[PDB]
Structure 1
Amino acid sequence: GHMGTNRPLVFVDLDDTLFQTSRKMVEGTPRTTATLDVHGQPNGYMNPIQHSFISWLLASADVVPVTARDVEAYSRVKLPFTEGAICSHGGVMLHSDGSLDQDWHGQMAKSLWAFQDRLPALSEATLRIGKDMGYSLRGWVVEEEGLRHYVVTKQNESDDAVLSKVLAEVQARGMLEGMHIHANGNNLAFLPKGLAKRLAVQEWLRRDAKINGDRPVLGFGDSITDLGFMGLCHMWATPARSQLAKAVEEM
């Protein structure tokens, strides 16, 4: 029989799914501010279709962000999400009021302690190996309070092909055993095995079923690696020109 709410539970990726930076939109296109930079100035935008879509979705369903952004970067997303969030590539769950989920934090700590030294080592070694190939890079360890989650690397050449090369050699030098990777645009991330949007969404669904039983679950994402959590949903969806959609086109 029926228990709780029967409205869809919708997991949405953020960057390049609901909004994007100015460089990724045609100049002069009308836009609404969706995110701020660390200096507090607008830096991510929705075009009119994107704003209409997320407004409709937020009013019609229970919408939960599922994002690579860490908690601080998620706090610069200026969209009125009301159901909590999954952040840091599934390393963090936030309650509806934005406070940290202590249970998940404990479980993630358990999956990640064996990596706490390797992640700063791997970032420094990646940034050195890139400077040795002549590429001006930029990188850091993404970390919640205390706990280090994953390594991110970007390039300063206006040439995303650089990162695919670095990925090739790091893979060769064997530096990525026991880890998985995300690459989309000017972003190359190395993730420990127990860190994945899929794992956090799986737990979110386990909790939801105890309150609301089985209700429709929709997943929206733009990256090929978003297929991890999207495959847990009853239906999954992608923007027409996403990395995922372009790969499907080529198939």
Structure 2
Amino acid sequence: GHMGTNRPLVFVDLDDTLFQTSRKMVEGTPRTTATLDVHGQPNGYMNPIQHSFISWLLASADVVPVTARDVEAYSRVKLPFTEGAICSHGGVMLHSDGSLDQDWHGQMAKSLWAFQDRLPALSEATLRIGKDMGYSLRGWVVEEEGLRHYVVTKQNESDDAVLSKVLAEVQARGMLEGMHIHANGNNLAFLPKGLAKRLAVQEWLRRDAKINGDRPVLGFGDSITDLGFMGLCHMWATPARSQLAKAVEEMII
């Protein structure tokens, strides 16, 4: 029979699904502010269709962000999400009021303690292996309170093909066993096995089913690696020009 709410539960990626930076839009086109930079100034935008879409979705369903952003960067997202969030590539769950989920934090600490020294070492080596190769990079360890989660690397060349080079080398040098990778645009991330959007979405659904039983689940994402959590949904969706959609277009023809 029916229990709890029967409205859809919608897991949404953030960057390049709901909004994007100025450099990824055509100059001069209408837009509204979706994110702020660390200096408090706008740095991510929605075009009019994007704003209409997320407003409709927020009003029509229970919308849960599923994002690589850490808690601080998620707090600079200026959208009125009301149901909590999954942050830091699945390393963090936030309650609706923004407080940290202590249970998941405990489970994550368990999965990631074997990695706590390797992650700073791997970021150091990558940034050095990058200068060695000759690129002007940057990178850091994403961490949430002491617990270190994953490694991210970006380039300042305006050439995202730089990151594919490095990824090819670190793979050869075998610095990535027991881990998985995310590469989209100017972002290359190295993630421990037990850190994934999929695992957090899996847990979110387990908790939801105790309250609301089986209700429609929809997943929205733009990256190929978003297919991990999207495959847990009844239906999944992608923007027409996303990394994922472009890959699908090449597969059919």
- Class of the TM-score when normalised by the shorter of the 2 chains: over 0.9
Deviation digits for residues 137-158 of structure 1, max 9, x if unmatched?
0000000011000000000100
Partners of 1:2 and 1:29 in 2: CA distance: 46
Aligned position for 1:39: 39
Partners of 1:138 and 1:191 in 2: CA distance: 17
Please give the secondary structure, in 1, of the residue aligned with 2:153.
strand
Partners of 1:193 and 1:41 in 2: CA distance: 35
Partners of 2:155 and 2:50 in 1: CA distance: 28
Partners of 2:83 and 2:114 in 1: CA distance: 32
Does residue 228 of structure 2 align to residue 228 of structure 1? yes
Partners of 2:145 and 2:98 in 1: CA distance: 14
Q: Per-residue deviation at 1:201?
A: 0.0
Please give the secondary structure, in 2, of the residue aligned with 1:111.
helix
Partners of 1:147 and 1:71 in 2: CA distance: 13
Q: Per-residue deviation at 1:13?
A: 0.1
Percent of paired sites with the same residue:
100
Partners of 2:185 and 2:27 in 1: CA distance: 19
Deviation digits for residues 99-144 of structure 1, max 9, x if unmatched?
0000000000000000000000000000000000010000000000
* Runs of 4+ with deviation above 3 angstroms: none
Q: Per-residue deviation at 1:171?
A: 0.1
Q: Per-residue deviation at 1:247?
A: 0.2
Q: Which consecutive residues of structure 1, in runs of 5 or more, have no partner in the other structure?
A: none
Partners of 1:214 and 1:146 in 2: CA distance: 36
| TM-score, scaled to structure 2 | 0.99
Partners of 1:154 and 1:32 in 2: CA distance: 26
Partners of 1:80 and 1:138 in 2: CA distance: 31
Partners of 1:245 and 1:207 in 2: CA distance: 31
Q: What pairs with 1:1-251 in structure 2 (closer than 5 Å)?
A: 1-251=1-251
Q: Per-residue deviation at 1:40?
A: 0.2
Partners of 1:145 and 1:56 in 2: CA distance: 35
Deviation digits for residues 26-57 of structure 1, max 9, x if unmatched?
00110000000000000000000000000000
Deviation digits for residues 194-235 of structure 1, max 9, x if unmatched?
000000000000000000000000000000000000000000
Partners of 1:57 and 1:13 in 2: CA distance: 13
Partners of 1:214 and 1:203 in 2: CA distance: 14
| TM-score, scaled to structure 1 | 1.00
Q: Per-residue deviation at 1:187?
A: 0.1
Please give the secondary structure, in 2, of the residue aligned with 1:218.
strand
- What RMSD over aligned residues (CA atoms) do the two structures have, in Å? 0.2
Q: Per-residue deviation at 1:161?
A: 0.1
Q: Per-residue deviation at 1:191?
A: 0.1
Partners of 2:100 and 2:249 in 1: CA distance: 39
Partners of 2:247 and 2:23 in 1: CA distance: 22
Deviation digits for residues 165-190 of structure 1, max 9, x if unmatched?
00000000000000000000000000
Partners of 1:134 and 1:146 in 2: CA distance: 32
Length, aligned pairs only: 251
Partners of 2:117 and 2:33 in 1: CA distance: 38
